[PDB]
Amino acid sequence: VESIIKTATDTVKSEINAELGVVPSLNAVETGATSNTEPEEAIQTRTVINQHGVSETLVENFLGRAALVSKKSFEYKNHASTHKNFFKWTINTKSFVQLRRKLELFTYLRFDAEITILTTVAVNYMGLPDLTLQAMFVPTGALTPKEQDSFHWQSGSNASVFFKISDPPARMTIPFMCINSAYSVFYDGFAGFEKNGLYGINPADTIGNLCVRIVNEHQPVGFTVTVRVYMKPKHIKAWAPRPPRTMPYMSIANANYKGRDTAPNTLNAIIGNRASVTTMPHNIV
Amino acid sequence: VESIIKTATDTVKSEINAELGVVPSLNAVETGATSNTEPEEAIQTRTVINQHGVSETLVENFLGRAALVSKKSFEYKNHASTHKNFFKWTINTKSFVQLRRKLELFTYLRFDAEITILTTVAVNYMGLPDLTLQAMFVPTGALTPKEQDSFHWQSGSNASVFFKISDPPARMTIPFMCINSAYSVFYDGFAGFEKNGLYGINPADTIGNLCVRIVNEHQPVGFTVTVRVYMKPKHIKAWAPRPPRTMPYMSIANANYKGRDTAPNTLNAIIGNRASVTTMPHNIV
Amino acid sequence: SDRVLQLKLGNSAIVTQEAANYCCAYGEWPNYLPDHEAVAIDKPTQPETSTDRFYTLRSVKWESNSTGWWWKLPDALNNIGMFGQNVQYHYLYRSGFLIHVQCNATKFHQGALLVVAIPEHQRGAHDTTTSPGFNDIMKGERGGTFNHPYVLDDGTSIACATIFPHQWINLRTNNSATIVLPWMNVAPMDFPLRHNQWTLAVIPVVPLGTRTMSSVVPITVSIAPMCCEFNGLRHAI
Amino acid sequence: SDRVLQLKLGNSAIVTQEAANYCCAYGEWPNYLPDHEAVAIDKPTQPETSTDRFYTLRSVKWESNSTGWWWKLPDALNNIGMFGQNVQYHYLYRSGFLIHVQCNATKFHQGALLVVAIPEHQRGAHDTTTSPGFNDIMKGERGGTFNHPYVLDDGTSIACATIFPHQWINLRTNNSATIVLPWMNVAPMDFPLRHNQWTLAVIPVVPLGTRTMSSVVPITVSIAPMCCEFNGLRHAI
Amino acid sequence: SDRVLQLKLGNSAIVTQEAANYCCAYGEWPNYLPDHEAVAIDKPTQPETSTDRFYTLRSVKWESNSTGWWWKLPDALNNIGMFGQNVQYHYLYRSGFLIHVQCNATKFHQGALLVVAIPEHQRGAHDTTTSPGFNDIMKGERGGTFNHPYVLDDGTSIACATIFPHQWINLRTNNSATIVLPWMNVAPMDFPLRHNQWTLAVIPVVPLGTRTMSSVVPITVSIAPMCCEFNGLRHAI
Amino acid sequence: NLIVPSESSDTCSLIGFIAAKDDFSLRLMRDSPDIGQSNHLHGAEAAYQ
Amino acid sequence: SMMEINNTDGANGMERLRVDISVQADLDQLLFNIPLDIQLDGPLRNTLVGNISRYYTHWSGSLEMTFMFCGSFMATGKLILCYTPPGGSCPTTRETAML
Amino acid sequence: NFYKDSYAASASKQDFSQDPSKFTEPVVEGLKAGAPVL
Amino acid sequence: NFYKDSYAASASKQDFSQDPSKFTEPVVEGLKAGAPVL
Ligand SMILES: CC(=O)N[C@H]1[C@H]([C@H](O)[C@H](O)CO)O[C@@](OC[C@H]2O[C@@H](O[C@H]3[C@H](O)[C@@H](O)[C@H](O)O[C@@H]3CO)[C@H](O)[C@@H](O)[C@H]2O)(C(=O)O)C[C@@H]1O
């Protein structure tokens, strides 16, 4: 039943129906199939050549957006006496709700990830320094630097990108790097051979670590530096759509839920209340 | 009667006329048709091969100009104690009179909109910071951020453009996005099912909201930041030309009029006065 | 030859022996909605003769100090005959209009009326920032009058109103004006009770005058919807 | 196969899962007035979907002592929807009718309703020489009830009423009856406000009965005009 | 015709006389691992009939206040029959599943169960940041119950759970639901003791009700692995 | 009317479902109003430790 | 997917996903109504079509509502479901909705 | 245009077709050169 | 794409094939137009 759809389907004119043994409007929800009643069979229709496009809902476009996945502020200064001029971030797409919810509309996803890094500075006035930063990709669980001036930043094999605050945001693509044919947006299991591991966390789905430091030595005064990382999935393939998240997220480590204090989206009632089932909200007066 | 016109029409030489039953200079304005008397029929003409071009008056060029549509100044500082380092603007082409009047020379318009954003800064002296700004497109009526540091800026699906003051003005094209085949420059109706809605305002013609913030945290001192937005319509199609606006504009929400205190363009007299209908202004002495 | 004319639609007919040709707005003619432009998928009702016929509104008196009159479409007809009924029982409507304005006098009378069909004539209010209210716009069959015809009550000008489909009724020349209006909108159909596609404006640019016996000189408007179509049937509003 | 049925006209549709085939009065089907049978020469209006659709009347309650109900056509619909409007604005009308009577109960209920379409059912009054009055005949949407169903309120008999187009609703068998009615008259068209072509009669020949929980058992009538045509347009009556 | 069904695998067979067709998850059917998708290079064992057969789990009682039940695969079967043995002696397994949920009552009973197969149903804990523990997830043959079926115990919703392969058991209509599940994973094979590909959820969206004699109404689940393959043989865990 | 015998429940339920037909089209993508946050989710900061 | 038609105070969790109808004593009774804006909070918001549509701003196309009766086999009945194009107040009588 | 969406392209200043008559002579009966309009 | 690795390429927004039936009609026996589903 696979076919190429580029526009919404057309409508054909229909006439009066009075056929015994034919009841297109009746269905059996129990079969699990969605009703197949066509407009032409429910009412009398006219012919309509529908030219409405369907490209903006292509999965590639739906998920094809650079969404914020990480925001980190730290102090750039003399740390003689906390993120000391650098930080390490275990990449994940569970911290910011907008991206998280969209990705979670699918069970499995295969995509390459375009990473964009935006840097901002503020004095703690005599001007803003045009600093050089280094973002080093370190595999999940692998050895990360522990100091701004660590020799580990020599990045002999790890990929590192050096960029200035005055340059456009840095950008690079991390390929689909899962050990499987697709990432598991959801994982009903324990990724360990013992029974004490974390539930729902399959490290195979953790792209990796992003170690970011300011290359410049500290200045005589302190600054607040904020690094924002954006991710845009591309060359996407998606499988098994899922029920959208309704309850507010509680943790990046699980699907735990509590609900809002009052509707909407309270554990007790997802939709806001109306006086009764015969009360029409926004009724035209 | 459609034809391709690339130059002003030529003139053909004409001779003496003395024909009974033929009166090209007489017309009947009552029919609603404009006089069809040709120069060749009114006087004796010579032949003229006219090479004057007509391209600068093409609608595409006439409206094809980046006109100022929004200018907003705000204070960038610590707002502990007003636009707090960001602002929201409901896009409209009714605030600046030059663009407004030209667009209003037409009833319906279909065009894509090229948006250019220019940013300027001034200290409230130790130098001008090269700040990063974020302009997020939010559909008309949709959810806009309420704080500079709101999580809503994560822009998971909304389009956002990040730009520096030191970069050239930011630019992007908003497609013709109306739910109709063209924008209604004028709307003789109420866009609501009840009777208390606003007259002449069809939200279908409101491109959307532009939420702009400074990404950098505040500095130790304050600055005045001004954001100017320009719009250039392109791939234009126009219908039903209209009488040009004469009375000064009063509101962006309607065509209300009052007129200037004295001619010209006073409700009582559009054209400035002359002593009498036999008085020749600027007469050569 | 182009001074006499008969218009016949449904069970109605009109003749004039002093016409001035007639205007087809933007050189077009009314037509039913083609399948390649349709949006609403329900089979439309096309009443034909019960709606596509001349409806004559109440007349108005042309006085020496008159400023002009206006009628909005389809509002002026939304409560008249079968056209009105279909409009009330259906969410969507579509149609063109054949307009015939009538005014006769004497060979001793003078006066000139600009008869213009304005698309999307969005009125403006005078000397205030408050937008016109519902009752300022929806006058129905009675129509309204111009406050400042000089600027078409919208801050522009009547001088350039000739850019719109129009004719004139110059008493020494003709006694009627005829304008054929096609569907004019950015959508294939619309909700008739909240939006008016056209506004018929009749304005005396040259006042009525004479030195002969004074008589009441009326101006009458007859409008015939054309190629009416209705979709979205329900109860009457 | 002949127990399930879906009827679709205009924006309305009805299904039944317990039908008994369906009746086409005298083996005919509705159709528009052909040129070789026409009388009125004005071009007719054929609204199609705005009138040729199902109109559901108020229900009635089937009680242990009910005598029967009746609805006259087109009277019952002369003030309903667009069909009603066309009827009021036109001197002449013509149409067929698709009738669907509905009544469901329980597998523990019993009862049998004769659902018959009577042409020209001229009522008689009981024990008096005075003919029935206007208000005794024109009941409109509410319909009326039988005084002496045994003789069809006309001095004849319900026993032989089966000679007319009909079906039955026997609770243990079906829950609906469907009858398609063609135009039935001696004239090609008629004045809808003074003459009724058909009379829908629903009579309980076998009373409603059960020993299970008592519940209100309604009887509902849905009627869809078919191939409507109207001539002689004027103002509404 | 699509109400009766017989399923036969190995030495087991099941019939139902009130089915509702049957579901093939995502329109697929189980199959053995092809050479062009294989990873583990040791020759696999394909037991066929000793494992690809129906295993009936202990029943559960449908009560007026029940919230729903769930069983995870292959966990629910990891200790049952030869399928269980192969699972215990092999590091890797692969298979589809034929699911048959059974529940019969009376023509006087009402109730509706959503029978849905959820891929990767990662449970969430309620009102706490602590992730669910091993014993909260691995219930085995007994299965578990829903705490908040309204949100599928994962913060989403049962209302949209129909996006997953499913059927319903509406007592007045059918007495069983059947779903064929193909291998569903991002890997060609997996370690059966730590990851569950599918979760069978049976939730009463419409509670069980009647006014007739109360009887215990059980819900029974029978599951047949399909096209089982095992790799990485060693001792039993 | 809803009609039932003495032993059937006299109150019954309906479950309503809705879906788009294949003549549907959606345009102009925007952030969903159905999800939002005002703080860091639990564990988010730990990703930096 | 399921519409949350019974979104009323006193209806908790799944009770909100089903509409209960009872044997009536009067005729032509109104049972319930449903607001139709798939872009606003209401019975249609938390559905597959509602949720995904809300990631967009413009929409076009036909919608289909399917209702499954979940009473006992011995229960019978006939209901009328009406869709009223916009324009006025929501109909409160069958004679009006039926149009 | 190196962008994938055609609406991103530069301006289109090549449409030289015109039909003034729809505004200048929208009368049903064509008017002749020097013949009386009425 | 001037890069040597194909995964570095711009987005691929040209896959217009669909098969809703895998979600809308995953029933083994095809359902007819107006014939009783059961
Ligand atoms: C993340 C989340 O919970 N999103 C829901 C959203 C938010 O809860 C609100 O925006 C929080 O302010 O609500 C959604 O439903 C709309 C609600 O509207 C409330 O009444 C509003 C009214 O609609 C506004 O026009 C008015 O200006 O303010 C009123 C409140 O004072 C109702 O009371 C409530 O029950 C909802 O119906 C939404 O669509 O925004 C649903 C989101 O999932």
Name the descriptors.
part of a larger assembly; 9 chains; A: 285 residues; mainly beta; Jelly Rolls; five-stranded antiparallel β-sheet; four-stranded antiparallel β-sheet; 3 helices; 11 strands; 6% helix; elongated; F: 49 residues; 2 strands; binds a molecule of 3 linked components (BGC-GAL-SIA); virus; Beta jelly roll
Structural write-up:
- The structure is cut from a larger assembly and holds two copies of chain A (285 residues), three copies of chain C (237 residues), two copies of chain F and two copies of chain H (38 residues).
- With 237 residues, chain C is mainly β.
- Chain C is 5% helix and 37% strand.
- In chain C, strands 3, 4, 5, 7, 11 and 13 form a six-stranded mixed β-sheet that branches. In chain C, strands 9-6-12-8-10 form a five-stranded antiparallel β-sheet, with no helix packed on it.
- Chain F is built from no helices and two strands.
- With 49 residues, chain F is an all-beta fold.
- With 38 residues, chain H is mostly loops.
- Chain H has one domain.
- The N and C termini of chain H lie far apart (55 Å).
- Chains A and E meet through strand 9 of A and helix 2 and strand 10 of E.
- The structure holds a molecule of 3 linked components (BGC-GAL-SIA).
- A molecule of 3 linked components (BGC-GAL-SIA) sits between chains A (260, 263-265, 272) and F (33-36).
- Chain G: It is found in: Virion; Host cytoplasm.
Of all chain pairs, the largest interface belongs to: A-E, 50 and 57 residues
Radius of gyration of chain C: 18 Å
Question: In CATH terms, what is the architecture of chain C?
Answer: Sandwich
Helix/strand-derived class of chain F? mainly beta
Subcellular location (chains H, I): Virion
Protein name (chains H, I): Capsid protein VP4
Subunit structure (chains H, I): Interacts with capsid protein VP1 and capsid protein VP3.
How is the secondary structure organized here?
This is part of a larger assembly, with two copies of chain A (285 residues), three copies of chain C (237 residues), two copies of chain F and two copies of chain H (38 residues).
Chain A: E1 3-4, E2 17-20, H1 39-42, H2 59-63, E3 67-76, E4 86-90, H3 97-103, E5 106-123, E6 132-138, E7 160-164, E8 170-174, E9 183-184, E10 209-214, E11 223-241
Antiparallel strand pairs in A: 3-11, 4-10, 5-8, 5-9, 5-11, 6-7, 6-10
Chain F: E1 11-20, E2 25-29
Chain H: E1 17-18, H1 21-24
The structure holds a molecule of 3 linked components (BGC-GAL-SIA).
A molecule of 3 linked components (BGC-GAL-SIA) sits between chains A (260, 263-265, 272) and F (33-36).
